[PDB]
């Protein structure tokens, strides 16, 4: 991963996020690619599921209001963008979480605010 | 086993081993080459054993160029003979090699196999040699 590649990865993540209404932070340690592929299938219809480096997102977060998620990057980082709709992936990630239980939703971000595990679960229902 | 088809004189003085090579010091045909570093008569068989060694490792692809040709004969008197009574009959053909001379040149797609193959050829030559590529 060259320095130019590291920089352009920030730009694409920022470009992806800018049109993304909300973000969800989740933990993926211990999930096979096949099951991850089903989550990609459960999310790729409308949303976008990604895993990126902690500091790569950090620089890709200083632009917009995801500067407030710096404390949610401690540990494995899996981020879900919702370019289509708002809560569609929120149900899917919780349902996938209940299916595997090796996944922990670290937190979420929507409309300029950061929320905890219970709160994003509340917005998952709403 | 390379020998000249015919030679004007069959018994010759021993080629002298002084100096360093003036011509043929740079790889011209292939992409890698073996450069000598010490003076020694590279005989007829050593070339054959080395050339076979290159072909075995590179298998199918690639081409090998042998810039050294053994056309200088060497003689030996028949075994169990006192000295005198003329010069012995020619026995083996050698090619005089000076430091800087490029013996073999090998062309192959990937570098790693090509360098390994040329390394095996070096172990079949009496001289200390090094592998040299084409660019500066």
């Amino acid at each position: 991963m060259a320095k130019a590649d590291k920089a352009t990865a920030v730009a694409d993540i920022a470009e992806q996020f800018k049109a993304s209404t909300a973000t969800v932070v989740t933990e993926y340690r211990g999930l096979t690619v096949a099951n991850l592929a089903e989550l990609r299938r459960a999310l790729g219809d409308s949303a976008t599921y990604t895993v990126a480096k902690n500091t790569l997102v950090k620089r890709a977060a200083s632009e917009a209001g995801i500067e407030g998620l710096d404390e949610l990057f401690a540990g494995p980082t899996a981020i879900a963008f919702v370019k289509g709709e708002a809560v569609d992936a929120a149900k899917a990630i919780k349902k996938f979480a209940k299916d595997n239980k090796a996944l922990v939703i670290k937190g979420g971000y929507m409309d300029g605010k950061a929320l905890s595990v219970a709160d994003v679960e509340k917005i998952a229902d709403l | 086993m390379l020998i000249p088809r015919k030679v004007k004189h069959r018994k010759q003085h021993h080629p002298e081993q002084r100096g360093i090579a003036s011509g043929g010091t740079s790889v011209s045909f292939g992409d890698y080459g073996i450069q000598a570093l010490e003076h020694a008569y590279i005989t007829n068989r050593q070339i054959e054993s080395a050339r076979i060694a290159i072909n075995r490792h590179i298998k199918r692809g690639g081409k090998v160029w042998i810039n050294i040709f053994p056309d200088r004969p060497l003689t030996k008197k028949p075994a169990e003979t006192r000295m005198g009574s003329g010069k012995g009959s020619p026995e083996w053909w050698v090619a005089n090699v000076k430091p800087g001379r490029v013996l073999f040149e090998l062309s192959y797609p990937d570098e790693k196999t090509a360098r390994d193959a040329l390394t095996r050829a070096i172990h079949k030559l009496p001289i200390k040699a090094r592998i040299v590529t084409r660019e500066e």
């Binding site: - | 390379l2 690639g62 800087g100 660019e135």
Partner: protein, 192 residues
Amino acid sequence: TANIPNKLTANVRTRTGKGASRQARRDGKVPAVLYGHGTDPQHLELNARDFAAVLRSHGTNAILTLDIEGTEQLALTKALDVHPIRRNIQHADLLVVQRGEKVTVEVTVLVEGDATPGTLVTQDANTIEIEAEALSIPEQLTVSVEGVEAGTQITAGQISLPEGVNLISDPELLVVNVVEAPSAEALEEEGA
């Protein structure tokens, strides 16, 4: 292709000869001479490390702007003398050139691409002749071999050259030759 001259500092030589030149090399300086259309041979000593650095980056045909005792002269590396074993630079010939002058020099050729699987690519000629303006000299030329099949000869005339560049060498030179890959039956035959 317009390139910026490389700056070097050169000083004249008090004593010339194999005694002095050997000592100068031992000091890390490479003796050189400078002649040109001005008809004025000058004996200079360049620093070996910086001269090596210029050549490594800008190729063997590097355009120079020497500083000979406070005077700036534009010079071109006509030729070099590399010891066969030590691979040093024993001596360099520098030719003065004015901007806008046609100079005939040799540039290298690189083959870039991916040949067909059943193909061995052979480069017969390393360098080709070129006439170009002193500052418009290309550092190297490229030849592309992708999807080429059978025995196809890429001759000198087929190469594409930058604007203002002429092919002094005749086009008939066969710079690149592509042939069918030899088989183990063919390898164990030649040389016997």
